[PDB]
Design a protein around this ligand. Structure first.
Ligand SMILES: [Zn+2]
Lengths: 206, 179, 165, 116, 121, 71, 22
RNA sequence: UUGACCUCAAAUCAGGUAGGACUACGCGCUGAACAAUAAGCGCAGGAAAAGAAAAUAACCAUGAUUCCCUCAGUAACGGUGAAGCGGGAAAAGCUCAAAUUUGAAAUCUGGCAACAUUUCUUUUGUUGUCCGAGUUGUAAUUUCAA
RNA sequence: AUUGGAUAUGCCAUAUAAAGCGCUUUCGAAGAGUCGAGUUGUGCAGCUCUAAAUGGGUGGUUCAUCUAA
RNA sequence: GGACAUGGGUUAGUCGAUCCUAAGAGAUAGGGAAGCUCCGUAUGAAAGUUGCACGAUUUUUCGUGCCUAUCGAAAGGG
RNA sequence: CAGAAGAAUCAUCGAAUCUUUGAACGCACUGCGCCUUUGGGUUCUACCAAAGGCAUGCCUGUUUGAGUGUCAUU
C-alpha cells in the first residue's frame, strides 16, 4: 500500500497528537460535551440564529417602502458570534453561556477561553466541530458562540441548559482537565516499546 | 471501536514506515551484503567534550545540571513512534560545541590494537616511499636580426626557454651594471 | 478582543503550550514542501499587525530556511521569486528547530480588484514597489542595511569645483 | 570624480521658473507659508532669532486658530515644538495675529440639500 | 487604381471577387515580364499590387469594425481590439482606482479643504 | 569544426559539445553581457538592428498614445 | 544542405555582385 | 446512511500575472590584486533611495526627509576623517495593529443584465441581481500630535 | 483638435446624516526569538541563552529627550 | 585559371534521413544555495493523452470490476 | 533609363498588414504530434488542405474530486 503524502500526513498527525504529552490547556479540548446535552444546547441556539442575508434585506426593504410612501421596534435577540466579540462579551460579564469549538485550527485562538470563561464566572462548554457552530450562524465556521440575552419565553430553557452544562461538563471532567493529556498507546504498543526500551537501555547508549 | 481503529492505524503507520526504511536501505550494496551475512559507550565527540568537562572540573557539575533544563530536554522522546523519532534525531538535534581535545581522545579510543603493527608501519610506509621514488624518477639566445626582426611570439626554429636581444638593450645592460 | 491574548501568549515561546505546539507544527511543516501555501496564518495576531487583512488578494506562504545574511531576509527573497506575480508585503517568525527556521510571508496580489480598489493598499500596485524584497525595502531589508534615524546608523571622495573658485 | 558647477546659472533660472509656475497655480496667495520665529539651540546663537518650522499647538490655540483650519489658510503646524517660556509664546502669537489681520479668505461653495 | 471610398460602399462578396480577378491579373503580368514584356506591363504590376493591398485593407477594416460592433459594451473583448499604449500603462492604476480615498480622507477634504486666500502687503 | 551557427544571434559561435553559444549565451534566457567588454556591448546593443517597435513607441508618445480616427 | 544554408549561400553569393550601371 | 467542515488535489476550467532588453543616474548583494573600488549577481523609476524622530542638544532651546554652503581637514581615532549648531533650496503630511457595529458584516471580488462613459467601438465606471469571500474579523471610529 | 484647475449657471443630493471647537463627578488599548546578555564574524549577521510595563531607547550631570521591533 | 560576367543544371511511395534503442545526457518530483545556480532521473509524486471493460439509466447528482518526458546512430535494428 | 500622366523615393500619422526566429510558449532542432471546426476533388469510411487552438510558475474564482483528517445525523 502506498498512501499519498497528504493522507499519510493526516493520519500521522492523528497518532502523533495521541502519543505525545498534550498540556492541560490543550488536552481539555479532547473532552467535549456529551451528545445529549449538545443536542439540547443547539435546540436553544437554533431559536436565536442571526437572520439570513436575504431575510435581513427583506426586512430592510420592507421598512424602506414604508418611508418611501410616508411614516419604535424591539431590540433584536440572537446568538453572539465572533472571537473578538465573544471575548469582549465574556470580559464584560455579559455572556450567559459560551460554546467553544473543539477543533479550532491554530488552537491558541481558543486555548485561553476556558480559563477566561472560568475566571469571569461564565458557564462554558466545549462542543464538537467548528462546523456545527458555523451552521447556527449561517457561516462555514464559528470558533466560539455565546448567548447574552434570550426572550422571556426561553429564560427557563436556558436555565436548564446552563445547569446541564454545569452538571455534565464542569462538575464532570474538572480534575480530568487538570491532567496532562496524551501518552495513549495501542494494545500491543507498550509491549513493543518495552522490548525496544530494554534493548536500547542494555548497550545502545552512545 | 475508537480504540481498535486507533490501534490498527498505529500498526499500519509503523508497518508502512518499516517497509520504507527497508527498501531505502536495499539501495545500498553494502547493506545487502550485510543481510546476506546498563552501561554507555562514549563514541560521539559531543559526548566526549561533555565528559571531558565533567572530569576536568572546568565546568561545574551544578552548573551543567542547570544548563540541562532547556528547550530541548523538555521535548521528551518517551514512547514516540519510530517514523517520528527518526526524523526528529536527523533534524531536531541540538548541535553542541566541539573541542579538539575530545577529537583526539576519540581517535585514541578508535585506535585498534592492530591499527599500526610492525607490518602496517613498515611496508605501508615502504610502499608510499617507493611510490614517491618512482614518481620522482618519472635559455636559447636569439638575436633580433634578419627574419627575426619585429617578432611578437615564438620565432621560427626556436623551442623551449628563449631570450631576445636586439643590440639596443646593450646600452641598458651597461647602465644596469654600473648601477 | 482575542488578539491581545494571542500577543501576550506568543511572548512565552517555551511554555508548555508554546513548546508542545512548536514541535507538533515543526514536524508538520517538515512533511510539507519547503515553500508551501498557508491557507490561513498560524499567528493571526502577528500577521494582522504586519498589514495582513483577511480579504481576497492577501496571500500567506510558509517557508523554512536552514540556520547556521539574515534568515528572515532569505525567506522573503525565496518566496517572492517563487510567487513572482505578487508583492512581498511583510513577514514574521512562526517556528524553529535545530535545523530550520520557519517563516510566514504576507504577499499581496497587485492585479486583484479588491487590492487595486483599496485606498490603504493601493500604494503597492504602483511599479516602484516591484520586488521590495529584492531591493532591501522590506522591514527586515531596511534593518539589514542600517536604514534608521539616529547616530547609531559619494560626497566624500568627490571634488566639487565651483565656477568662481 | 570631479563635480562641476557649469549648470549653476541653469539651476538658478530653473528655480525662478518653478516659483513662477507655483504663482500660476496659486495667484492671489503667497508662494511661501508663514514660518514662526524661534531661537537657535546653542549658547553661541541663542541671542538671534530665525524662522522655525511651524507654530505649536498652543500658539495656534492662543491666537484663536484651530489645528485643522491652520493648514487650510496656510499656517504650518509643528506638533513637536513646545513653549518652554512665555517669551516664545507671545512672540509667535503676534506673528499669527498679524497674519490673520492681513489675510483675505475667499469663501467656498457649500453644498446644501433640498431639505435638512 | 481603385478608389477606396468606392470600395467601402460595396459588399465583401463583391470585394472578394475583385480580389480574385486582381490576383489573376497580377499573375499574368508577372508571367509576361519573365517572358518578355513592355513598359506598360511593368507599370501595371505595381498598380495591381497596390490595388490588391487596397482591397485587402477594406476587407480587413470591415471585418474589424464588425467585430467591434459585436463586442461593444462587453466586459471582455479580443486582445487585438483592446488598447495598446505600452505594457506599463495597461498595468497601472486606473484614474478611478488612483483617486479612491478612504472615508476618513473624504471627510477631511469635505470639512477642511485647502482654501484660497491672500495677504495684503 | 568546434562551433556552429547559433539560432539566437546568428553567429557561428554555438559550441557543438557544450551546446552553448559563446557570443550571447544561448540557450540561456538572459543574453551574455559583461561590462569589461564595453566594445562587445556596443556591437550588438539596441540600435544595431531594425528597432521597428521602439521607433513606433517613440513616434506615438508625442500625441499621448492616442487611438481612434480623426473627424 | 537545409533550406537555411541554401538561402545563406545564395545571399553570400548575392553580396559579391557587380554594381548596376545605373 | 445522508450531510456539514478542514486539509489537499485536478482541469487546453473563467479572468489575470511573472520572465527578456536597456541599465547614465538609483537600491540591494558579493568582492579582489594593487577599495563599502573594478569585475560578477539581483531589482526599479522618471527620478530611485530617504522621510514625519525609540532625533538632537544641555540653549532664551531646536523639530520628518533630501540637497547645497558652512561647520572642517575640525573633534575623535591613530594618516584617516565626521556630526550638532549656523546660512540657504524645497516644504506636507499621514495610514495601520492593539477598542464590542453587537440595536443587526454596516465591507468586498466575480458572473449575468441593463445603463452610461471614453485620448478610445480600444477607456472607465455605475445601477440591479445572483453565487461567493469574510466573524480564525471585511467597513465606520482611533494612531499618542492623541 | 485633445485636455487642466477655477468661475457663472441648470438639474440632482440616500441630511433620521457628517464634522471642528469648547466642557468633563466617565475611559484611554500602543507592535517579542524582538530588545538585551554571551560569543563568533564583517552598526550589521550567525550561533547559544532569552526579557520588561512610567516599561524601554538614547543623551547628560537624579535630570533631559525620544517612543523601536 | 577553381578568375570575372551572363544564363542553365540536382525531379524518388521502393535510395538515405524521417521510426527504434545503446553507453550516456537530460527537463520533471523533491532538496540545496545570499546568488548567478547545483544536486537529483520512479526519488516516500494523488506520475493513467479517452488505462480498459461492464450497465434495459443509477432515488434521470455514476456505480461495479480489472490492469497498473526528451535527446542521443545519415556505419547498429528496419 | 524606360514608362505612367489628387501626382509624390512628399510630409504627417490616431486605422491596418507585420514572413522565420528570439523572454519564445504543442514536442524537437531536416522534422514529429495531438485537439475543435470548416472546405476540396474523375469523387468522398480514403486522401488532402485551411482556420482556431495545446508552455511553465503563481493569484482570484468555478467545477469535479480524494482523505482509517474533524464531526453531525432515531
Ligand atoms: Zn548566440
Amino acid at each position: 500500500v502506498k498512501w499519498p503524502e497528504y493522507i499519510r500526513l493526516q493520519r500521522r498527525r492523528k497518532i502523533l497528537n495521541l502519543r505525545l504529552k498534550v498540556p492541560p490547556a490543550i488536552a481539555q479540548f479532547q473532552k467535549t460535551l456529551d451528545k445529549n446535552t449538545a443536542t439540547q444546547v443547539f435546540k436553544l441556539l437554533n431559536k436565536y440564529r442571526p437572520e439570513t442575508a436575504a431575510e435581513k434585506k427583506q426586512r430592510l426593504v420592507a421598512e424602506a417602502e414604508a418611508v418611501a410612501n410616508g411614516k419604535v421596534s424591539k431590540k433584536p435577540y440572537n446568538v453572539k458570534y465572533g472571537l473578538n466579540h465573544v471575548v469582549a462579551l465574556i470580559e464584560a460579564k455579559k455572556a450567559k453561556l459560551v460554546l467553544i469549538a473543539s477543533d479550532v485550527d491554530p488552537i491558541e485562538l481558543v486555548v485561553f477561553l476556558p480559563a477566561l470563561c472560568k475566571k469571569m464566572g461564565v458557564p462554558y462548554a466545549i462542543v464538537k466541530n467548528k462546523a456545527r457552530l458555523g451552521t447556527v450562524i449561517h457561516q462555514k465556521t464559528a470558533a466560539v458562540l455565546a448567548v447574552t440575552e434570550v426572550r422571556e419565553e426561553d429564560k427557563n430553557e436556558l436555565a436548564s441548559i446552563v445547569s446541564a452544562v454545569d452538571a455534565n461538563f464542569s462538575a464532570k471532567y474538572d480534575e480530568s482537565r487538570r491532567k496532562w493529556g496524551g501518552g495513549i498507546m495501542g494494545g500491543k504498543t507498550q509491549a513493543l516499546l518495552a522490548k525496544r526500551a530494554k534493548a536500547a537501555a542494555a548497550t545502545v547508549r552512545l | 471501536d475508537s480504540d481498535d481503529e486507533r490501534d490498527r492505524l498505529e500498526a499500519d503507520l509503523d508497518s508502512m514506515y518499516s517497509d520504507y526504511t527497508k527498501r531505502k536501505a536495499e539501495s545500498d550494496v553494502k547493506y545487502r551484503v550485510k543481510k546476506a551475512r546498563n552501561n554507555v559507550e562514549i563514541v560521539t565527540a559531543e559526548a566526549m567534550t561533555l565528559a571531558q568537562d565533567i572530569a576536568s572540573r572546568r565546568k561545574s557539575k551544578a552548573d551543567l545540571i542547570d544548563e540541562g533544563y532547556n528547550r530541548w530536554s523538555f521535548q521528551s522522546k518517551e514512547g514516540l513512534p519510530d517514523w517520528f523519532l527518526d526524523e526528529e534525531t536527523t533534524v531536531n538535534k541540538p548541535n553542541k560545541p566541539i573541542t579538539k581535545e575530545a577529537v583526539l581522545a576519540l581517535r585514541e579510543k578508535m585506535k585498534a590494537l592492530n591499527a599500526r603493527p610492525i607490518k602496517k608501519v613498515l611496508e605501508a610506509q615502504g610502499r608510499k616511499k617507493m611510490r614517491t621514488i618512482k614518481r620522482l624518477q618519472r635559455p636559447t639566445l636569439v638575436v633580433a636580426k634578419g627574419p627575426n626582426k619585429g617578432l611578437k611570439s615564438r620565432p621560427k626554429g626556436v623551442k623551449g626557454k628563449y631570450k631576445m636581444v636586439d643590440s639596443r638593450m646593450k646600452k641598458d645592460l651597461r647602465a644596469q651594471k654600473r648601477l | 478582543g482575542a488578539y491581545k491574548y494571542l500577543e501576550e501568549l506568543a511572548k512565552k515561546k517555551q511554555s508548555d503550550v508554546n513548546l508542545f505546539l512548536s514541535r507538533v507544527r515543526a514536524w508538520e511543516y517538515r512533511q510539507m514542501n519547503v515553500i508551501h501555501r498557508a491557507s490561513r496564518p498560524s499567528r493571526p495576531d502577528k500577521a494582522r499587525r504586519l498589514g495582513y487583512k483577511a480579504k481576497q488578494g492577501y496571500v500567506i506562504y510558509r517557508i523554512r530556511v536552514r540556520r547556521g545574511r539574515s534568515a528572515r531576509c532569505t525567506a522573503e527573497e525565496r518566496v517572492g521569486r517563487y510567487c513572482s506575480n505578487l508583492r512581498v508585503l511583510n513577514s514574521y517568525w512562526v517556528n524553529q528547530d535545530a535545523t530550520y527556521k520557519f517563516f510566514e510571508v504576507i504577499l499581496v496580489d497587485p492585479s486583484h480588484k479588491a487590492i487595486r480598489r483599496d485606498p490603504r493598499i493601493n500604494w503597492i500596485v504602483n511599479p516602484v514597489h516591484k520586488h521590495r524584497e529584492s531591493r532591501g525595502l522590506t522591514s527586515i531589508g531596511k534593518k539589514s542595511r542600517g536604514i534608521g534615524k539616529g547616530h547609531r546608523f559619494l560626497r566624500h571622495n568627490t571634488l566639487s569645483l565651483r565656477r568662481y573658485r | 570624480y570631479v563635480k562641476t558647477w557649469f549648470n549653476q546659472p541653469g539651476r538658478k533660472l530653473r528655480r525662478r521658473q518653478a516659483r513662477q509656475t507655483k504663482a500660476a497655480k496659486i495667484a492671489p496667495r503667497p508662494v511661501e507659508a508663514i514660518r514662526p520665529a524661534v531661537k537657535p539651540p546653542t549658547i553661541r546663537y541663542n541671542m538671534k532669532v530665525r524662522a522655525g518650522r511651524g507654530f505649536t499647538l498652543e500658539e495656534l490655540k492662543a491666537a484663536g486658530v484651530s489645528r485643522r483650519v491652520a493648514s487650510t489658510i496656510g499656517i504650518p503646524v509643528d506638533h513637536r515644538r513646545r513653549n518652554r517660556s512665555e517669551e516664545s509664546l507671545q512672540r509667535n502669537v503676534e506673528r499669527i495675529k498679524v497674519y490673520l489681520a492681513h489675510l483675505i479668505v475667499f469663501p467656498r461653495k457649500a453644498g446644501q440639500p433640498k431639505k435638512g | 487604381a481603385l478608389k477606396t471610398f468606392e470600395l467601402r460602399k460595396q459588399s465583401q462578396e463583391n470585394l472578394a471577387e475583385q480580389l480574385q480577378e486582381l490576383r489573376q491579373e497580377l499573375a499574368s503580368l508577372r508571367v509576361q515580364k519573365i517572358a518578355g514584356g513592355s513598359g506598360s506591363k511593368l507599370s501595371k504590376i505595381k498598380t495591381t499590387r497596390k490595388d490588391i493591398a487596397r482591397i485587402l485593407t477594406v476587407i480587413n477594416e470591415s471585418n474589424r469594425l464588425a467585430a467591434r460592433e459585436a463586442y461593444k459594451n462587453k466586459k471582455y473583448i479580443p486582445l487585438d481590439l483592446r488598447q495598446k499604449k505600452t505594457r506599463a500603462i495597461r498595468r497601472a492604476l486606473t484614474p478611478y482606482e488612483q483617486s479612491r480615498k478612504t472615508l476618513k480622507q473624504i471627510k477631511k477634504e469635505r470639512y477642511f479643504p485647502l482654501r484660497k486666500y491672500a495677504l495684503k502687503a | 569544426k568546434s562551433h556552429t551557427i547559433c539560432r539566437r544571434c546568428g553567429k557561428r559561435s554555438f559550441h557543438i559539445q557544450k551546446s552553448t553559444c559563446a557570443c550571447c549565451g544561448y540557450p540561456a534566457a538572459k543574453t551574455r553581457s559583461y561590462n569589461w567588454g564595453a566594445k562587445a556591448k556596443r556591437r550588438r546593443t539596441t540600435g544595431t538592428g531594425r528597432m521597428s517597435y521602439l521607433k513606433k513607441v517613440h513616434r506615438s508618445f508625442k500625441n499621448g498614445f492616442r487611438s481612434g480616427k480623426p473627424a | 544542405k537545409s533550406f537555411r544554408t541554401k538561402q545563406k549561400l545564395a545571399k553570400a553569393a548575392r553580396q559579391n555582385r557587380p554594381i548596376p550601371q545605373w
